[PDB]
Amino acid sequence: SEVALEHKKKIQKQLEHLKKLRKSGEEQRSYGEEKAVSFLKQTEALKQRVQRKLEQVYYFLEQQEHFFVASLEDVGQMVGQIRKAYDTRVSQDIALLDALIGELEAKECQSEWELLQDIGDILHRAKTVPVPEKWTTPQEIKQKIQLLHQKSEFVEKSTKYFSETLRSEMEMFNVPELIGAQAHAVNVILDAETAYPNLIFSDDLKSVRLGNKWERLPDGPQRFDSCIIVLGSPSFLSGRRYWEVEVGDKTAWILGACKTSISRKGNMTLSPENGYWVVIMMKENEYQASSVPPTRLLIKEPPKRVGIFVDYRVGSISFYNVTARSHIYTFASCSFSGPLQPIFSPGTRDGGKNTAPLTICPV
Amino acid sequence: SEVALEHKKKIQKQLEHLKKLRKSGEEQRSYGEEKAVSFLKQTEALKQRVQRKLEQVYYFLEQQEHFFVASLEDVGQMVGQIRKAYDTRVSQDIALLDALIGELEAKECQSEWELLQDIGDILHRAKTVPVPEKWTTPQEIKQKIQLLHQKSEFVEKSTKYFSETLRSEMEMFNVPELIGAQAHAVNVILDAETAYPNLIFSDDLKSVRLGNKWERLPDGPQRFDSCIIVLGSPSFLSGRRYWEVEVGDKTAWILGACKTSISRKGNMTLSPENGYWVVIMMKENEYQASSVPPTRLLIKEPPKRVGIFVDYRVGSISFYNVTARSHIYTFASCSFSGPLQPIFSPGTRDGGKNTAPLTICPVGGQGPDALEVLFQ
């Protein structure tokens, strides 16, 4: 019948369909397997890499502890022995003396006649008695102790450095990439009432450069007379804040953030303690962070544009190379709590090599 | 009687004597005690001092290991779940497909009447079966893994210098202080036949400086034409050897030791692989050792006199700042497979600023050793 033949036709068709789907299914199941294996292979490689390094550190430390502990036991042993032997010998000396004293005292309570007869050699023996042993510190104790001090010194230096790099890396782990920092962009302007008197400003207060000696803003108390500096608006009490500055081919500058209450007097250094968290460009290919002492930074691709990121939650301030989309430097967490604001210096003219302005730029 | 009185006098005298001795004895006994306990206390203080620091470090390391392993576990866990869940689901899809295929294959071999009865439902279900789930990698795996890389990098940046410092301090245990090395003084002269042609030498072969280009020694195959160097005599096959060089206020130079068989061609780097163990002064307050990559050295009190110490047994070569009586650098654990000799460079003239000679200088405690130029 027509309907049976037709149904057989459709059965064949559907069989083909189903078989193609099944084949796709197998390929897919297999590929999932391949990807899983590939993932675990990656993780295992990483695992083994970390495992070697830790194993190596632990080995050296076990060695260090072993030897130090042996050194302690050794010196302890020596000093114990010398102490005991000396105490015993000098006590033998005093005992001998005590007996001779006893004898002479015993000669008293004798009659003259008895005395002359029984005097014996006591006087000679008294006259020739050894002087009790003088304590003299042996060199062996002194060197073993000095070795211990040296190893202690090594330990303090090495563990200090380790503690510091570890903390550095620990803090580095939550610093955002550039786009994350950029999410918190704010609009910053220059507060010209704070400026060093020879600074010159664009009409939009986004740009600042250093003028010559006869180019002077009107004097006022709010100016930083003694530092080539200018502050930015707004201030910050909280949250995450970001801005960007075009530095171009300048040879010198200062960028970062400061406490709003920094002293306007010039006898203070730029440092966290005085309320500054900045990066300074000294000259071409010389950058340093204003840590104490300052940390020199090697930046493979010099920045044409620098990003500044304040994060109040963790109390950290980070710097980004916008040009190369890379991290420059982050100041230690819990540096600050009170209000902050941006700070700028376009540096000195450097003969004419550094006359270009700094420019605050929108993201 | 007179004799009795005398006996009594001598008796009293000796009592006073013995009493002074006893008192001194007591004082010394107690002072000895003090000095000893004082040592025991010092030791113990050192002990507690170190023990606290190490405990802290161990703690920090335990924390890093946990930090890393938590990610390892997290990654392993996610890949595990995604993998099993996906496999199980697609396997269900494929099995459903297999079942429908089974049904159809059974129907196509049934009698016509039997075939016609239930066919519509099976065919509908065949037509409408979903395509088996396609594998798509979740971002989460990619992320957790990248995080794991970040953490391994964390562990390495945190630990590297520290592990290297521990290794170095270990290697330093067989390196004497300066007088220990000076103990092995030997007398070295310059082998002028090996010298870069514009180099100039003293009569006694202890001094070498760089002359101008028109000052040329007679040319020969044995000279270093492409490098401003000269080698020293004698060579060493063994033992511990020490010598000293006055560098004074020079701004550039090379000092150290090399394999006698170094290439006389100038296309090789100064490096262990090429048979060089040297320290180079680049300019004022910049020194580096020819490790690979170079180890840059900052020296607080610059040397006017530099000591070189080869220890062939343990394969080390050490460098000393004689002026400050301090250590500059050590190549440790080197593979020495043959004779070594001294090597020198007076640097370039640098605009008249580095024109002064290097002078091999004897150490005070050595006999004269005349005349050594008869062994060269």
Residue numbers in the entry:
A (entry chain B): 413 to 775
B (entry chain A): 413 to 788
The authors write:
The tripartite motif (TRIM) consists of an N-terminal RING domain, one or two B-box domains and a C-terminal coiled-coil domain. Almost 50% of all TRIM proteins - including TRIM20 - carry a B30.2 domain immediately after the coiled-coil domain of the central TRIM motif. TRIM20 is associated with the auto-inflammatory disease Familial Mediterranean Fever (FMF) and it is involved in the modulation of the pro-inflammatory cytokine pro-interleukin-1β (pro-IL-1β)67. TRIM20 is considered to inhibit the inflammasome mediated maturation of pro-IL-1β8, but it can also potently induce the maturation of this cytokine.
Here we present the crystal structure of the TRIM20 coiled-coil/B30.2 fragment at 2.4 Å resolution. TRIM20Δ413 crystallized in space group P21 with 6 chains in the asymmetric unit. In the crystal TRIM20Δ413 forms a clear dimer with a coat-hanger-like shape. Dimerization is achieved by the coiled-coil motifs (E414–N586) that form an elongated and slightly bend scaffold for the globular B30.2 domain (E589–G776). The B30.2 domain is connected to the scaffold domain by a flexible loop (V587-P588) that acts as a hinge. The subunits of the TRIM20Δ413 dimer arrange in an antiparallel fashion along helix α1 with a shared interface of more than 4700 Å2. As a result, the presumed B-box domains at the N-termini of TRIM20Δ413 are positioned approximately 170 Å apart from each other, whereas the B30.2 domains are close to the 2-fold axis of the dimer. Within the TRIM20Δ413 dimer the B30.2 domains neither interact with each other nor with the CHS domain, supporting the assumption that the orientation of the B30.2 domain might be highly flexible in solution. However, B30.2 and CHS domains share interfaces between neighboring dimers. These inter-molecular interfaces cover areas between 1710 and 1950 Å2 and are formed by the extended proline-rich stretch of the CHS domain that runs through a shallow surface cleft between the Pry- and Spry segments of the neighboring B30.2 domain. Therefore, we refer to the conformation seen in the crystal structure of TRIM20Δ413 as the closed state.
